[PDB]
Design a protein around this ligand. Structure first.
Ligand code: A1A9D
Length: 167
């Protein structure tokens, strides 16, 4: 039993809700919130910009030190950093950005990072400003993640469309 509320159960382990991931994380304080990161951890917009703003830019400060030490992530890769005031840990995961021409096949690799964590609050990877089809992202999530994932969907029409079209 955990403290996530109002989620529709899609499968044994995947749950979905129309919610603002920042407000969700602040309420639940999950062990892990997933960020829709880029390889440079430049949290400008989308989910990443929103989460970073909620940390008063502390996420960006921590991220800049991470990059200065380690260099960029790989597309499809991840790193674990602090969750600041939002969660214990933030798993920064780089899904392919279609608007940069990146290979959508790397989306499965991106979701595989979730399997290293028993429970996560997450967005749909490569959705929103990353330019992929959210229906496809949900399908890959369901077919890749085996741990318990609570998906927070910003767009209401999308949430309803994702639910009504879910196979
Ligand atoms: C619509 C896309 C882009 C934004 N994003 C979000 N999802 C959940 N909570 C959020 N809070 C702020 C942004 C955001 C979706 C990720 O596929």
């Amino acid at each position: 039993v955990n403290s996530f509320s109002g989620y529709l159960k899609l499968t044994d382990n995947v749950y979905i809700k129309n919610a603002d991931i920042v407000e969700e994380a602040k309420k639940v304080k999950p062990t892990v919130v997933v960020n829709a990161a880029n390889v440079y951890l430049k949290h400008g917009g989308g989910v990443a910009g929103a989460l970073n703003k909620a940390t008063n830019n502390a996420m960006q400060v921590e991220s800049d030190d991470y990059i200065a030490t380690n260099g960029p992530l790989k597309v499809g890769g991840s790193c674990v950093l602090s969750g600041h005031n939002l969660a214990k840990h933030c798993l920064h995961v780089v899904g392919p950005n279609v608007n940069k021409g990146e290979d959508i096949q790397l989306l499965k690799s991106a979701y595989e990072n979730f399997n290293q964590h028993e429970v996560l609050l997450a967005p749909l990877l490569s959705a929103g400003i990353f330019g992929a089809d959210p229906i496809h992202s949900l399908r890959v999530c369901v077919d890749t993640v085996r741990t318990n994932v609570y998906l927070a969907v910003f767009d209401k029409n999308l949430y309803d469309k994702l639910v009504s079209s879910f196979l």
